[PDB]
Design a protein around this ligand. Sequence first.
Ligand SMILES: *C(=O)CCCCCCCCCCCCCCC
Lengths: 191, 186, 207, 179, 156
Amino acid sequence: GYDYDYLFKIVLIGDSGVGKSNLLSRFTTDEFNIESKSTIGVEFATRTIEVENKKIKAQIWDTAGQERYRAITSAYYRGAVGALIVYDISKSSSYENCNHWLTELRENADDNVAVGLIGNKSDLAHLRAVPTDEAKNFAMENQMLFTETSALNSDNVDKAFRELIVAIFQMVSKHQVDLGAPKGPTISLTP
Amino acid sequence: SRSLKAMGEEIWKNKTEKINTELFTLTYGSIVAQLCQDYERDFNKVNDHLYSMGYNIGCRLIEDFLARTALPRCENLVKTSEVLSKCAFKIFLNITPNITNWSHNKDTFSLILDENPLADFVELPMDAMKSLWYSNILCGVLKGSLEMVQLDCDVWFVSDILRGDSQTEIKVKLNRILKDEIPIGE
Amino acid sequence: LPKVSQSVYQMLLNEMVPLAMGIERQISRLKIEEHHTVDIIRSHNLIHELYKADEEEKEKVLARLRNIGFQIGLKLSELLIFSNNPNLKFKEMDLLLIMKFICRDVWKQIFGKQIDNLKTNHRGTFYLLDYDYRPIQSFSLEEDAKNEELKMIEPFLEIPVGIIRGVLSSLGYSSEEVICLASFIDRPTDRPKTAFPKGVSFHVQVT
Amino acid sequence: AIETILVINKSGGLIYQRNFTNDEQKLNSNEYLILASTLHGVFAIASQLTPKALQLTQQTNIENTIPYIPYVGMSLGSFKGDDFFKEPFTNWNKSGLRQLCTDQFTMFIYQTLTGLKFVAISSSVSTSNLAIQIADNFLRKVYCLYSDYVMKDPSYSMEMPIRSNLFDEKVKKMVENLQ
Amino acid sequence: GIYSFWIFDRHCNCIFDREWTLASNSASGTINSKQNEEDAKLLYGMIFSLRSITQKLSKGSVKNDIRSISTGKYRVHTYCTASGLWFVLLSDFKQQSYTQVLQYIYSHIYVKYVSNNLLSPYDFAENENEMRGQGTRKITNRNFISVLESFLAPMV
Ligand SMILES: *C(=O)CCCCCCCCCCCCCCC
C-alpha cells in the first residue's frame, strides 16, 4: 500500500518520566513490534492523512535516553522535519529542560524545523507546578505551537497534530501541477 | 537436517556414557524408600516433596539436553510432543513413550510409559495401593524442563501400572506459552 | 543388557544433600501444581544452609545421608554378588579380600574407574585413596574462596562411605563394629592437575 | 540469488520496496518502514562497538580497497560502455553494519558517502568475503542507476519516496541477469 | 583471533563478560569489570533487534536464528540456544565462522561447570526485581574461568 506521496519524520522528544509513552499510546496505528524503546532508543508510530489530495505518511519516533545513550540519541535527528516537545504540568524540573531540549534540537536537526509543545496529563489540578500563561509566553518567543492535553479533554492533541502536519506541508511542499494522436497508414519520406 | 529417529539413535549410540539400569533403579528406590521411612508414611504429600525433587532436577537437566541436541525453541504442542516422545527420553532413559489421547484443539496430550526403568521391580505396601505414585520425579522433571524451554504446563499422573491400572499415563496439559522478557528501560 | 545415561545418574547421585536438608525443613518459592500451592526451594540455597545451619542439624543431615548411602550399598551388594560372583565368604577374617572386592567391582559399577592404590595395615584399619572422584569433579565457588569450598562440599563425601558400610553389611560385619570417615587428606602425588585439586581418602575401621 | 532490495534516504524511512520474489507477499507494506528504520538505528548503534584493541590502533587501510568483479551487471543511460566501471574502488562504511547472515537469507548493506543506504536481501547463503565483494559491486550498479534515474528527475523531491518506472524496470533488468 | 566473549541469559542480563588486548596470551583482559557494563546493554539491544527482524521477515516453518553480524572492523559470531542463552564472540574475519567453537563451549564448558555445579546458582535473577535486566549476579566459577582461559588462549 505505497500510496502515500510524502513521508515526514517527527520526533516525540521529551524528558524521561513525563508520561509521553502514555501520550502517544492514544493516537496510534498500534501493531507490529512494540516496546522497542530500550532495544535501541526508539519506538515507532505511523499514520496516513489526506491533505488536499496529497496523502502524507507520518513517522513518530519516540527517542529516549536514560544514562548511556549519548551519541546515537543525537544522531537520530539527522533529518528530522518535525518535533513534538513533550512536557508535564506536574513539576518544574520537567519544564526546566525544555530550553536545553530545543537548543539540541535546533543545533542538530534540520534547519528551520517545525516544533510543537505538548503538556501531558492536564487532568491533575492538584499539582499544577507551572502556569499555562508562562508556558504560552515561552511558546511565543520561538514561533512554536502550544497545547495541553488530557484523557478527558480529548481531540486536542489530534487537532494539534493534524494542524502541525498541514503547517509543515506548506513549508516542504513544492507546487505540483497535474501534467489526438495521428492514427493511420504511413509513407516514408527519408532520403 | 535429519529425522528425530536418526538423531536419537546417533546421539544414544556414540555420544553418551552408560551404566546398568539396575543401579539407577536402586538409587531412586533408595530415595523413595527413605522418604517413606522418615516421614511417618504420609503418602498424601510425600508426592509434593518428590515433585520439588523432580522440578529441581529437570530445570538443570534441560541445559544438557539442549546442549547435545541443539534444537530450536519448540513453539507448538505437536513439535513438543514429538521431541519429548522421540529423543528427549531416548537420550537419557533409552525408552520411546507412545502418545495417544489427544485432547481438543491440541492443548493436552498423554505420555504412555511402556517400560519404566524407575520401577523395574517394586511391590508397594498395602496402604500405598491408592495413595503413592512412586514416579512423581518424572513429571516434575518434565515440567521443570519445559519451564526453561518457556512454556508452562500442568503435568500429572493419570494411571500407573504399579498401583494396579493397565498402563502408566502422564497428562502434560499446556497452560500458557509465557513470552520472552524485554529490558524495562523507561 | 539395558542401560541408562551416566549424566543423569551422576547428577541424581550428586543431588541428595539438598534433598536431605530440605526434608529436615519439611519435618521441623510458592507455585500451583494443579489446585494447591506447593513450595519449592533451590539446591544451592540448601547447600549453603547446610554449610551454615548449626552443628546438631548438620550432624542430623550427615547421619541422614549416611543412612541413604547405607541403603544403596547394602542393596546393591546382592546384585554384585550375583553378577560378578567373586571368591568371598560370608564372614571372612581376611579383610584384604573384602577390600579388594570393593575396590575392584563395587566402584567399577558405581563410578567409571577403579579406585587407586590402597594401604595395608594387616592388623586393624584400611585406607582407600581416590583421585579426582568423578561425581564432584565439576564443583567450585570462587577464585579465592577455596577454604570455604572444602568445608561446604563436606556432606557429598558421605554416600560412598554409606556405600562401603552397606557393602560390608550383608557380607558379614554389621553396622555396630565398623566405622568409616572420609576426608581430603589425600594429596595429589604426581597425577595431572584436574579441575578438583584434592583427592579423597576413606579411612575404614574394622576390628 | 538476490530476492529483494530496499534503500534508505539519509535519516531512516523506507523509499523503495520492490520485491523480486515469485509470489510471497507475506510482509505488510507498513512494517517495512519499521524494518528500514530499525536497520538504520542498528547501523548507528553498532558504530560505538569497535573493540578497544582496534579503537586506538587500526593499521588496516590496505583492505578497504575492494577488487573489481568483471561483469557482475549483465550479459545504457548517462553511463556508456560495456559496464558502468572498470577500476576497483574504496569502502566508505568501515565501522558499520555491512552484513547480516542468516540460515535462510543474507542482508548486505552499502552506504553512500553522503549517507544513503542500500540493502540487498538474498536468499542464497563465497567465504563471507567474496559475497561482500559481489554485493558491493552490484549495489553500486544499483546506486549508479539510482543517480541516473531518480536524481535527474523533475517530479521528485529530495529524500522522499521513489515513484518511477524507468528505475524499477532497470533494476529489475539488473537483477534478473544476476542469479 | 577473538576480541571479546559474552554470555547473556533469558532475563536480558549479562552473565559473563570478557575482553582481550594485544595478542599476548596472558593479556590484560580485565574479567567481569564494571566498565564493560556500559557497552553491554547496547550490544544486547543490537542482537535482540536483529533477532527480532530475522524472526519477523523469516519464511518457512523453522524460525531461523542469526549466525553472524559483520562490520568493517570485525564480525560478531552469535550462537543462540532454546533455553534463552546467547553466546556472543567478536573477532576479525580470518576464517568462515566459529559456530563449532561456540557449540563446543556450550556442550563442554557451560554445561559441565554451570549445569553440573549443584553448589552454584542458575537463573541468576531471583526474587523479582532483576528478571528484566537491572541486576548483577554474574558467574565467578573458578573452574569455568580456568577452562575458558585455557581453551580460548591459543585462538588470539
Ligand atoms: C523443545 O525443544 C522442547 C524440548 C523438550 C524438553 C526436554 C525434556 C528433558 C527431560 C526428559 C526426562 C529426563 C529423565 C528424568 C527422570 C530421572
